[PDB]
Amino acid sequence: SSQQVWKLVIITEEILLKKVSKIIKEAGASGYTVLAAAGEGSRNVRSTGEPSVSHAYSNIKFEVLTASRELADQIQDKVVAKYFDDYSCITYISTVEAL
Amino acid sequence: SSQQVWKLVIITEEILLKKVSKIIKEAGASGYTVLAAAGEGSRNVRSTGEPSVSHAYSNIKFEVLTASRELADQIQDKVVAKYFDDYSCITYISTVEAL
Amino acid sequence: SSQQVWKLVIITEEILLKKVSKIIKEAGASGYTVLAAAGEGSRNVRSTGEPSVSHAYSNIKFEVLTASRELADQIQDKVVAKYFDDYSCITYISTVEAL
Ligand SMILES: Nc1ncnc2c1ncn2[C@@H]1O[C@H](COP(=O)(O)OP(=O)(O)OP(=O)(O)O)[C@@H](O)[C@H]1O
Ligand SMILES: Nc1ncnc2c1ncn2[C@@H]1O[C@H](COP(=O)(O)OP(=O)(O)OP(=O)(O)O)[C@@H](O)[C@H]1O
Ligand SMILES: Nc1ncnc2c1ncn2[C@@H]1O[C@H](COP(=O)(O)OP(=O)(O)OP(=O)(O)O)[C@@H](O)[C@H]1O
Ligand SMILES: [Ca+2]
Ligand SMILES: [Ca+2]
Ligand SMILES: [Ca+2]
Ligand SMILES: [Cl-]
């Protein structure tokens, strides 16, 4: 049988791995998944800088499944409020069907 | 032109890489993608144990595209029936548009 | 507040990392995320070959968020037209909610 859940993705600088993991757990999520990633973006806020000739930068990608949209929004808000202006970061939400 | 397909995700202990790959292929999927991952969860069933002070554990993330919901459900069922009680594992389904 | 965006995924041979990154950026995307991956598929076109007894092959997974479906389709088209016949490659699109 199915249950509709929300999937929050946070892609951010690899150096924020432990800090963002703590926000997710402190907010009451049941868990999280994290993957190593790389990327480029257009906000140009990376804490360690960017060179003139761009190349892919080191990131992590979190995926957090939540039983309510409310909880996904809360985690997203906390990460963005704390880090979005000072660190490269992008975030999005969608829905999936959990078992 | 587009075709609606289903995307099954399985996130599980890294030690199940070969066993789960075999279920996916034996069920008739056209392929699979797998990524290294880490994570934490709340079922507390990891086959290799967890310590009192939790940290991220080693996982793999599979993504399997299927032409029917029926096939995604079958693969999901087979993995869950065989491994969910004895190994850390979470699974979800959504739809995407293949070319 | 929310904005509906499109998410284009391209999973392809690891050797195409720089060539596909250039298409994404030359098309005007605001960024991209890329992850190391492995997989198997059924088209059997891998540029470096496949053995009789299959095993997972080395890939990369791109995710590209776009503000229009039009731009996702354009990037997808350019990658497919250039590489799909000569290199292992699969691609799909869905929608997500960006902040
Ligand atoms: N359109 C996009 N599609 C997919 N991933 C994106 C996109 N834009 C940004 N990202 C991802 O978010 C990360 C941070 O991008 P951000 O928008 O915060 O701009 P930035 O500070 O310029 O980042 P970077 O230093 O990596 O260029 C990128 O490295 C990438 O992994
Ligand atoms: N809410 C969640 N959101 C995202 N990923 C999750 C979530 N819950 C669990 N996961 C992922 O599934 C994996 C296994 O979690 P499971 O629910 O089976 O509990 P567990 O046995 O307690 O896992 P772990 O030993 O990793 O803590 C986690 O390591 C994580 O990668
Ligand atoms: N049904 C699928 N679900 C998920 N990923 C898939 C699927 N089919 C293919 N892929 C991914 O796309 C990659 C390339 O598959 P493609 O369809 O191009 O066939 P191929 O040339 O036979 O690939 P391979 O040499 O990897 O077997 C695979 O390695 C896999 O990562
Ligand atoms: Ca940048
Ligand atoms: Ca646990
Ligand atoms: Ca093949
Ligand atoms: Cl991923």
What are the start-end ranges of the H helices in chain A? 17-26, 69-83
Dihedral sign for Cα A79, B64, C89, C50, please.
Answer: positive
Cβ(C46)–Cβ(C13) under 8 Å?
yes
Nearest to B18 by CA among C54, A34, C14, C52: C54
* Ligand 3 pocket test target in C9, C10, C11, C16 with most atoms within 8 Å of CB: C11
C64-83 b/e with 16+ CB inside 10 Å = b? Answer: bbbeeeebbbbbbeebeeeb
DSSP B81-94: HHHTTTS-EEEEEE
Cβ of B5 within 8 Å of Cβ of C59? The answer is: no
Report the number of secondary-structure helices (H) and strands (E) in chain C.
2, 4
Distance from C-alpha of C67 to C-alpha of C73, rounded to nearest angstrom = 11
**Tokens read off for A63:** 């995926």
Query: How many other β-carbons are positioned within 10 Å of the β-carbon of residue A77?
Result: 14
Kindly state if the Cβ of C59 falls inside 6 Å of ligand 3: yes
Cβ of C37 within 8 Å of Cβ of B32? The answer is: no
Residues of B in contact with C61 (CB under 8 A): 33, 35
Distance from C-alpha of B66 to C-alpha of B31, rounded to nearest angstrom = 9
Write down how long chain A is. 99
C86: containing domain: 1-99
Q: What is the DSSP letter of B14?
A: G
Write down how long chain C is. 99
Residue A63 is labelled as binding a ligand: yes
Cβ(A6)–Cβ(A85) under 8 Å?
no
Cβ(C94)–Cβ(B99) under 8 Å?
no
Q: Chain A residues within 8 A (CB-CB) of chain C?
A: 9, 11, 35-42, 56, 59, 61, 76, 80, 90-94
Q: Which residues, at least 6 apart from A45, have a Cβ–Cβ distance to it below 8 Å?
A: A85, A86, A87, A88
Domain count, chain A: 1
Residue type, C40: E
Indicate the SS3 state at residue C18.
Answer: helix
CATH of the domain at C21: 3.30.70.120
* Ligand 2 pocket test target in A24, A33, A63 with most atoms within 8 Å of CB: A33
State the ligand closest to the CA atom of A90.
1
After what residue numbers is chain A broken, C–N > 2.5 angstroms?
A: none
Q: Which residues, at least 6 apart from C49, have a Cβ–Cβ distance to it below 8 Å?
A: none
Shortest Cα–Cα distance, A5 to chain B (Å)? 9
